Structure formats: structure tokens, C-alpha cells
């Protein structure tokens, strides 16, 4: 036989979703459902959902396709759960492969075996731990993987362009010690440059300490040692293949206003900002549309994308 | 003792149906008369039997009666048996003379000719059981898969011809034609196989033909001939190599494409045997749909270990279709010019195509305007002695972080054939140079090569590329390589200015990290800098919102030129080789003095780059001569050259904004 040990939605489940889709506040509850063991970080959890959904995919006629999925980075002092969060990403993720630092060889590559992950992880969530530690040699390839969305192997050899369209998370320690919090908007990241852009969202988290927040940590930690989570992935698959929200003229002016704001004001405030940011705006909008199950994109969604990209920046 | 159980399928009348399939035909005189006679005429060996037409025939034999037993399912159901059955029928209908066959002419045909002559003579004298039909062939029967555009008849489930995963392969596909796909591995070098090998006797002669069956055979001596036999006593006999019929044999293993591999396991190779004409068709590293009968070849022993019998199999090659087969080579320019003309007649081809390169992004009509030229290139030159002068265009795209510079490069390397996309860390120095056991530059040459992250490429790489603008060269002196290989490559390089982005308080060449030795080579450097503008960025946002929202970008009104027909036009463009008139030449000169003088009167620092070295002149002659070719020219008119100057000045000078 071979029963393995450690999806089917039946009649009833899909109905539960359908009922639950109409409720206006669901997004926040969902976003809270990820973290039984983790405080706050509602914004980040929101993010991980918005990666699980991911802006459909759009392949133009006789032209290149615009990247659908959203990529995320987390930077902060240790104990931030950054390595703890990712495993829970992994479990409910429906795929994909995890990779930690070095790591490699080839990472996503076929290696052209005589005589990898990112390919095998296609349509899925790749995790990267200690994302900074990874040799630049690889990073050079990750540029090709992330935005371009394809992998190219000329090695000896079999010469082919094969597709890895994977979504990506990465957690990476601050440069030196705990200095992340106070340190400048740059020189803090340690891994310039285009990479910083490729990632749709750069989230920063601080371990800086306070007594009140401390107490509020204490109790939950205590109780820990003494609506269903599984329903979360079932909620997710139907949402994924059904149905793609397209795009609507309700929203566009919002994200345009927002975007232009970002460039003009933030280029005085902070960096980096490019057309890439705009792309990301659209992906987030569409993703939150998927959460809403709406056959259409909306203005509210646009405002949400606005919000999370703000907490990304500020 | 070995029971027997009837099956509805019968080969007897199916052979009859094959005979009715051959030489009696309409839809395409018939194709099987001419295709067969051209083989009989001995200019042709491979007989490519399409299963598509077998599909077409049944319609005429069914509906449209009178109804008959099916082949297309019955073939691929077995597909080994038909090679010995469907193909022998060709012997019965084949034209006898056929025309002008003679004897020698051909080597080894004279051997058998004299065999049948001496045999006929000696037999006709003795009377005063024949040479096997497989020895006399000199042609190979190959079936091909039905994908198919006409498979939609529909016979539905009839198709394999299902371009399946190596993982998808099962022990239930043995003895049934199956297409597979993957990268060629190890591609063993061709060696002769054997079929009959009729050994020669000594005393009384004759001949005997030993069948080559499965992998191997046991050689025999004794005597088969009745004359040498028993009196006196047993005649000695040796194999004659001239008499034997040799069929090329090449084996190669194919690993899976690795995208077809799950989250787990390992790439699994599949062993593939090749015969006859299809030999050498396969080359290492090449994704190919290989179709063939899927068969075991047991066991050679061992035979103790398995037990059993544990076949282990292989795939017989039948047909070969490789992914990614090309200008400048075409003869005609017959009714295809028609396919060019829809593009020509509207006029203003240059702007139209320009816009039609990478419409997926908004803005930068100038950049694309030039990329069209890059794709076109020409005309080089030969000084008759001779040495060459390229010959092509070299483009850079500067600026950061956004503006989507690299998407233009995925664009181009998608459109242009023989284009190859690489990155620095990325493509190793050994990636561009050729090892002895090439890539990048050698791999893509006669066509555009594309580079990203052009700063991070370090040093040894930059020397290669620094040299390749002498074109026609790389020189590898290391170890087991003294060769100088020829790279005719074009180069497009996307790079980011020194961190973070283009500091205006710094002079040009300060915020461009690149040496001036290299930039003099680049004829056109497009620096794309981003200064926020409330009006335009609205338009942009409208564009990038419109698509996503729609897939098709242009509306009201433009017609985006499909890359296929576009490639056709550019192909028809590269053929011209125009020549300059006296007036545009002088104009180029005068304008060049004015450009030199105006560039230097500007003074050192900021502004620049100087010095407008002669490679910019030659560059603008070469751009000129390119723009001419989209007029199809030979005239090379003044507006052409002027336009080249325009593109040049517009390239830079965007740093004043
Ligand atoms: Zn004899």
C-alpha cells in the first residue's frame, strides 16, 4: 500500500468561504490567523497573505509578461522571529522548498549534470534564510530569477531557457551587530543595490525594548506553554485558481496619485523608488482583490496596498 | 504447450490496407509514387512516413466507405512490427527500372548486382530460397508523430505524440511509439552496426545470410552449403565486409529538462538508439522532442542477477524535432515579399517598427528607435587587402534604478534570433571563452548579445568585451587552447551608474564607473535618467495600469508589428548593402568638425564625454548606413545622415534636464 504520514473542498467548505467573503472585516482576522505565537506584526502577516495570493499573472500578446507574484524581505535584530516566521510560511505554503544561506550549489539551476530548487519550486514559495550571507555569485543569478521570471542555462551543454516563476521570501541579519535600528536608511541593508529594489517590500523590525511591551510579551509567552488554521490553505487554493480579478478604473487614479507622491516626496525622504514600485502597487491591489474574492479590483484595495507600502516605507 | 488466444487485430488484411494506402492516393500524381521513385532513383534514402496522411486515408475509407480496420491506433499500439511489415510492402509496388540506375556508379551495388547475375546464370544453368529482402534496401522507413493541427478530426485519445515527461514514462509504454523531451546527454559517437554480413565460403562458394537480431548474434562456421558439405568434407567460410549492409548506429542518453522534476527526486536519463539517416541529427545540450518506438534489448547476460527478466529498455529514434531551429539565409522573396508589403505600404516603416520593439514598456521612443538599427546592423566593409571594419552597432543603456532598462533586453533577445541573454556573476569568464572538453559570445554571434549588471562583471570579463569590439576575435592562449575563434557578436549592455543614482554634483565619467578606453568603442550610449514629472508620470501610470488591466497595450490607434513578420522584414533589410553619395559624405564631415569643436569648446569636466574620437565618426557613418537600409536605399540620402546625428545628440544631452 504505502500510506504516507506526517485539496478537497467538498460541498460545505466552499459554502463557508462564500459566506465569509461578504464580511467586510475578514482581512484583519485572516491576517491574525497566521500568528498564534507571534505578537503584532499585523502588517507583515498581511504581507505574507498578499504573497500567497499574488496579483494573477499576465502574459501580453506577442510580448513579454509582467511579473505577477510579490517578493518580500525582513530585516531586524535577532529574536525578531524572522527565522521563526518562515517555517510557518513553509507549512501552509502549498510548496515550496526552503533554502538557508549557503546553501547552493546552483540554488535554482539544473547544474547541467555530467555525465535545482528555484525550478522545482515553480508556482510556489521559496524561503531564504540568512539571505545576506549568500555569495554574490548566486545573487547575480537571483536577479535573473526574480523579475525576469526565467532561468537561463548556457553551461556546456544543454542550452535552454527554463521557467522558474517562484514567489520569494528572505530574512537577513543587519550588517554588524544590533545596529539596524538607529543606523541610516542605507549602509544598514548591506546588500546593494538592485536587489533592494527587486524585493517588492522591505520590512524593518526592531528588537528595541520597553517595559510595558515587555509585560505584554510575558503573559502571552506564558499562556503559550499551556477560524481553524487548517481552513486557511483550503481558503487559499480556491481563491487562487478562482477567480482572477482583472483590473478596474475605480482604482487606477489612486495608485497613480500615490505613486507620484512616493517618488516626489520620498526621494527627499528616503530611497529607492522606481517604476518597479508602481508594478508592485498593482500586484498588491490585485492580491487584496483576491482576498476579497471580488471579480474586480477596487479603490479600497488600492488604499490597502497604499497602507502596507507606507508601513514598508514608514 | 504455449497456449494461443485470438485478438481482433489481424495483420493479413492490414497489409492489404497498407498496399491500398501506397501508390493509390489522391489528396496530395500521388505523393507515394514520387516520394518512392526518388528513392528508387537513389538520390534519397530516408522515407518519412507521416501518420497524418494515414489519418487522412481512413476518412476516405470509412464515411465515404467502404469501411476498414484502423491503423493509426494499431500502428502506435505496436509500431515495431510495422517497420518489418508496413515497410516491406514498398518492395511490391516499387518502380523496377527505375531510371538510369546502371551499376557503377555505386560502390557495393556492383557486388550484389554480380551476385544476382552469377546466381541467375548458375541457377538457370543448373536447372537446365533467395537473398533476403532486408539486404536489398538502401533506404530507411521513419514514422513521425501527429501533433496535430489536423488531429482535431477528431480522433482525440489517438495522440501519442503526447510530448510527455520522462517521469510520465511507464512500463506500459514499451512497444508503443512515444514522443519524449529533454536535454541530450553524452551523445555517444557514431559507430557502424550490422545487418547481413553474408559470409563467403571457399570451395563451392554460394552464400549464406545470418540475420542480425536483437543486440548480438553468434557467428557460425561449419558449412551450410550442401556441396562443400560431406564431400569433402566441410568447406571453410569467412565473412566478407564489402558484401555486408551497414546501418549507422549512434546511441545517446537524455536527462529530463529539470523543470519537469518534482520538488523531490532526481533527473532521470533515458537511453536512445539512432539509425540510418537520422544519425548526427542529435547534438549535446539540445532540448528535443524525440519520438520513437519504446523498446527493451535483452539481456546479453549476466542473466543470473535478473531474474527477471528486467528488460531495462531504451528508445529507438524515429523522428527528431528540436526546439529553437534564421536570417540572413533565405532564397525567396517569393510571395513573402507580400508579407513584407503590408508593412511597407503604410509608409514610415522606421517609426512604426521602432515603436513595435518592446511595446510592453512605455516611453523611450528614441531608445527603441535605435534598437531597431541595432537589430538591423550592417554594412561592415572589406578593404580588399584585406582587413575588416565592423560592421555592427554597440549599445549601452545607463541610468537607475528604474526605467525598466533590462526589459528592453529581454525584449530584444526574444525578438532577435541568435540572441543570448547573460548577466555578470552571472556568466563567468569561462562562460564567454571556450573550454576544451564556448558560451555567450561564441554561442551567440552573427546576432545580438545582451548584458545586465554590466558593472559587477569585475575585470577578466571586461577585457574580453573590451577586445571583442575589434570584432572578429577572441584569443585564448591558456593551457590546452591556442585557438583564436571568431565572434561576430553585437553587444548591448545595461549598466547602473555609480551609487546610488547619477549624482548630478558629480561630472559625467565620475558617475559612470567605466574607463574611457571602453566607451570610445560604444557608438551609442543611452543614459536614462529619472527626474519626477507630474504630467508624464500620469501617462505612464495610465499605461502600466491599462496593462496589467488589459494584455494588449496599444489602442486608438496603432498596430503593433508581430515579431515574426518583423523578423522577416529585417531579414529582407539586411540584404541590401547601400552606398553613400558624395553630398551626405561632405555633410557628415562638416557636421563632424562642428561637433568636435562644439564638444571641446565646452571645456573639461561635467558635460563631455570627449573627445569624439574617430570611432564616433565611423560610428555615425555606420548608423547612417543602417538607417539607409530601412529605406532599402543604396542611395544613402542626406536626411539619413542628419538623422544619425540626431540620434547621437539625443542619446546624451539628456543630462541637462
Ligand atoms: Zn562452399
UniProtKB/Swiss-Prot annotation, chain A:
GO terms for molecular function: ATP binding; ATP hydrolysis activity; chromatin binding; DNA replication origin binding; helicase activity; MCM complex binding; single-stranded DNA binding. Keywords: ATP-binding, DNA replication, DNA-binding, Helicase, Hydrolase, Nucleotide-binding, Nucleus, Phosphoprotein. The keyword Transcription does not apply. Component of the MCM2-7 complex. The complex forms a toroidal hexameric ring with the proposed subunit order MCM2-MCM6-MCM4-MCM7-MCM3-MCM5; loaded onto DNA, forms a head-head double hexamer. Interacts with CSM1. Acts as a component of the MCM2-7 complex (MCM complex) which is the putative replicative helicase essential for 'once per cell cycle' DNA replication initiation and elongation in eukaryotic cells. The active ATPase sites in the MCM2-7 ring are formed through the interaction surfaces of two neighboring subunits such that a critical structure of a conserved arginine finger motif is provided in trans relative to the ATP-binding site of the Walker A box of the adjacent subunit. The six ATPase active sites, however, are likely to contribute differentially to the complex helicase activity. Present with 35100 molecules/cell in log phase SD medium. Belongs to the MCM family. This is DNA replication licensing factor MCM3. It comes from Saccharomyces cerevisiae (strain ATCC 204508 / S288c). The gene is MCM3. The chain holds residues 325 to 738 of 971 of the full protein.
Curated annotation (Swiss-Prot), chain B:
PROSITE patterns: MCM_1, MCM_2. It is found in: Cytoplasm; Nucleus. SUPFAM superfamilies: Nucleic acid-binding proteins, P-loop containing nucleoside triphosphate hydrolases. ATP 1 binds at residues 362, 402, 404-406, 496. ATP 2 binds at residues 521, 615. CDD domains: MCM7. Keywords: ATP-binding, Cell cycle, Cytoplasm, DNA replication, DNA-binding, Helicase, Hydrolase, Nucleotide-binding, Nucleus, Phosphoprotein. Its main location: cytoplasm. The keyword Nucleotide-binding applies. GO terms for cellular component: chromosome, telomeric region; CMG complex; cytoplasm; DNA replication preinitiation complex; MCM complex; MCM core complex; nuclear pre-replicative complex; nuclear replication fork. A motif (Arginine finger) lies at residues 520-523. Its EC number is 3.6.4.12. Present with 166 molecules/cell in log phase SD medium. This is DNA replication licensing factor MCM7. It comes from Saccharomyces cerevisiae (strain ATCC 204508 / S288c) (Baker's yeast). The lineage of its organism: Eukaryota, Fungi, Dikarya, Ascomycota, Saccharomycotina.
Amino acid at each position: 500500500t504505502v500510506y504516507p504520514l506526517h485539496q478537497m473542498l467538498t460541498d460545505f467548505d466552499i459554502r463557508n468561504i462564500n459566506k465569509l467573503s461578504k464580511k467586510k472585516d475578514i482581512f484583519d482576522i485572516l491576517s491574525q490567523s497566521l500568528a498564534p505565537s507571534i505578537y503584532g506584526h499585523d502588517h507583515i502577516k498581511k504581507a505574507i497573505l498578499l504573497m500567497l495570493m499574488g496579483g494573477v499573472e499576465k502574459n501580453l500578446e506577442n510580448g513579454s509578461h509582467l511579473r505577477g507574484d510579490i517578493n518580500i524581505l525582513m530585516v531586524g535584530d535577532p529574536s525578531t522571529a524572522k527565522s521563526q516566521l518562515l517555517r510557518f510560511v513553509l507549512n501552509t505554503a502549498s510548496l515550496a522548498i526552503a533554502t538557508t544561506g549557503r546553501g547552493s550549489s546552483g540554488v535554482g539551476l539544473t547544474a547541467a549534470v555530467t555525465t535545482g530548487a528555484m525550478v522545482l519550486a515553480d508556482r510556489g514559495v521559496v524561503c531564504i534564510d540568512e539571505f545576506d550571507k549568500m555569495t554574490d555569485v548566486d545573487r547575480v543569478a537571483i536577479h535573473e530569477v526574480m523579475e525576469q521570471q526565467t532561468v537561463t542555462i548556457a553551461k556546456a551543454g544543454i542550452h535552454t531557457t527554463l521557467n522558474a516563476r517562484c514567489s520569494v521570501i528572505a530574512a537577513a541579519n543587519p550588517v554588524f551587530g544590533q545596529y539596524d535600528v538607529n543606523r541610516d536608511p542605507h549602509q544598514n541593508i548591506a546588500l546593494p543595490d538592485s536587489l533592494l529594489s527587486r524585493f517588492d517590500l522591505l520590512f524593518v523590525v526592531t528588537d528595541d525594548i520597553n517595559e510595558i511591551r515587555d509585560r505584554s510579551i510575558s503573559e502571552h509567552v506564558l499562556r503559550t506553554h499551556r477560524v481553524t488554521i487548517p481552513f486557511l490553505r483550503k481558503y487559499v487554493q480556491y481563491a487562487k485558481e478562482r477567480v482572477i480579478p482583472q483590473l478596474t478604473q475605480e482604482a487606477i487614479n489612486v495608485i497613480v496619485k500615490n505613486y507620484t507622491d512616493l517618488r516626489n516626496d520620498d526621494n527627499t525622504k528616503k530611497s529607492p523608488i522606481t517604476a518597479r514600485t508602481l508594478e508592485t502597487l498593482i500586484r498588491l491591489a490585485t492580491a487584496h482583490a483576491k482576498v476579497r474574492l471580488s471579480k474586480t479590483v477596487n479603490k479600497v484595495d488600492a488604499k490597502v496596498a497604499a497602507n502596507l507600502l507606507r508601513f514598508a516605507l514608514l | 504447450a504455449l497456449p494461443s488466444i485470438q485478438l481482433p487485430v489481424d495483420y493479413n488484411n492490414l497489409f492489404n490496407e497498407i498496399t491500398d494506402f501506397l501508390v493509390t492516393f489522391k489528396q496530395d500524381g500521388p505523393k507515394y509514387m514520387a516520394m518512392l521513385q526518388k528513392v528508387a532513383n537513389r538520390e534519397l534514402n530516408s522515407v518519412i512516413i507521416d501518420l497524418d496522411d494515414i489519418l487522412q486515408y481512413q476518412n476516405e475509407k470509412f464515411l465515404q466507405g467502404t469501411q476498414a480496420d484502423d491503423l493509426v491506433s494499431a500502428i502506435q499500439q505496436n509500431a515495431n512490427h510495422f517497420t518489418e511489415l508496413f515497410c516491406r510492402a514498398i518492395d511490391n509496388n516499387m518502380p523496377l527500372p527505375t531510371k538510369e540506375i546502371d551499376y557503377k556508379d555505386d560502390v557495393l551495388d556492383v557486388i550484389l548486382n554480380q551476385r544476382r547475375l552469377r546466381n541467375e546464370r548458375m541457377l538457370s544453368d543448373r536447372t537446365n530460397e533467395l537473398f533476403p529482402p532486408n539486404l536489398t534496401r538502401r533506404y530507411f522507413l521513419y514514422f513521425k508523430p501527429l501533433s496535430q493541427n489536423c488531429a482535431r478530426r477528431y480522433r482525440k485519445k489517438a495522440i501519442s505524440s503526447k510530448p510527455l515527461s520522462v517521469r510520465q514514462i511507464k512500463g506500459d509504454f514499451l512497444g508503443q511509439l512515444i514522443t519524449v523531451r529533454g536535454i541530450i546527454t553524452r551523445v555517444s559517437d557514431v559507430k557502424p552496426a550490422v545487418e547481413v554480413i553474408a559470409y563467403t565460403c571457399d570451395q563451392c562458394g554460394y552464400e549464406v545470410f545470418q540475420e542480425v537480431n536483437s543486440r548480438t548474434f553468434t557467428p557460425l562456421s561449419e558449412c551450410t552449403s550442401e556441396e562443400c558439405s560431406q564431400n569433402q568434407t566441410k568447406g571453410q567460410l569467412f565473412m566478407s565486409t564489402r558484401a555486408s549492409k551497414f546501418s549507422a548506429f549512434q546511441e545517446c542518453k537524455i536527462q529530463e529538462l529539470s523543470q519537469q522534476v518534482p520538488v523531490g527526486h532526481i533527473p532521470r536519463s533515458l537511453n536512445i538508439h539512432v539509425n540510418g539517416t537520422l544519425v548526427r541529427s542529435l547534438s549535446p545540450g539540445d532540448i528535443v522532442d524525440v519520438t520513437g518506438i519504446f523498446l527493451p534489448a535483452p539481456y546479453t547476460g549476466f542473466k543470473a542477477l535478473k531474474a527477471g527478466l528486467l528488460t531495462e529498455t531504451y528508445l529507438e529514434a524515429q523522428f527528431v524535432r528540436q526546439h529553437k531551429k534564421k536570417f540572413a539565409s533565405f532564397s525567396l522573396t517569393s510571395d513573402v515579399e507580400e508579407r513584407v508589403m503590408e508593412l511597407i505600404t503604410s509608409g514610415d516603416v522606421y517609426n512604426r517598427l521602432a515603436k513595435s520593439i518592446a511595446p510592453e514598456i512605455y516611453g523611450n521612443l528614441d531608445v527603441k528607435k535605435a534598437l531597431l538599427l541595432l537589430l538591423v546592423g550592417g554594412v561592415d566593409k572589406r578593404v580588399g587587402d584585406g582587413m575588416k571594419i565592423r560592421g555592427d552597432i554597440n549599445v549601452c543603456l545607463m541610468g537607475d534604478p528604474g526605467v525598466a532598462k533590462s526589459q528592453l533586453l529581454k525584449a530584444i533577445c526574444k525578438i532577435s534570433p541568435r540572441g543570448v541573454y547573460t548577466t555578470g556573476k552571472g556568466s563567468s569568464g569561462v562562460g564567454l571563452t571556450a573550454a576544451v572538453m564556448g558560451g555567450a559570445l561564441v554561442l551567440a554571434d552573427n546576432g545580438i548579445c545582451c548584458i545586465d549588471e554590466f558593472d559587477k562583471m569585475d575585470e577578466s570579463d571586461r577585457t574580453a568585451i573590451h577586445e571583442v569590439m575589434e570584432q572578429q576575435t577572441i584569443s585564448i592562449s591558456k593551457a590546452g587552447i591556442n585557438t583564436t575563434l571568431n565572434a561576430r557578436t553585437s553587444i548591448l549592455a545595461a549598466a547602473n551608474p555609480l551609487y546610488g543614482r547619477y549624482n548630478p554634483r558629480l561630472s559625467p565619467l565620475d558617475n559612470i564607473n567605466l574607463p574611457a578606453a571602453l566607451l570610445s568603442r560604444f557608438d551609442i550610449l543611452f543614459l536614462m535618467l529619472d527626474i519626477p514629472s507630474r504630467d508624464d508620470d500620469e501617462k505612464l501610470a495610465e499605461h502600466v495600469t491599462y496593462v496589467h488591466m488589459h494584455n494588449k497595450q496599444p489602442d486608438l490607434d496603432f498596430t503593433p508589428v508581430e515579431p515574426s513578420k518583423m523578423r522577416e522584414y529585417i531579414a529582407y533589410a539586411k540584404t541590401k548593402r547601400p552606398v553613400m553619395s558624395e553630398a551626405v559624405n561632405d555633410y557628415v564631415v562638416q557636421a563632424y568638425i562642428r561637433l568636435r569643436q562644439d564638444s571641446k569648446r565646452e571645456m573639461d569636466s561635467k558635460f563631455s564625454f570627449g573627445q569624439a574620437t574617430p570611432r564616433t565618426l565611423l560610428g555615425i557613418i555606420r548608423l547612417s548606413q543602417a538607417l539607409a537600409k530601412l529605406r532599402l536605399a543604396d542611395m544613402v540620402d542626406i536626411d539619413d545622415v542628419e538623422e544619425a546625428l540626431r540620434l547621437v545628440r539625443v542619446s546624451k544631452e539628456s543630462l541637462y534636464q
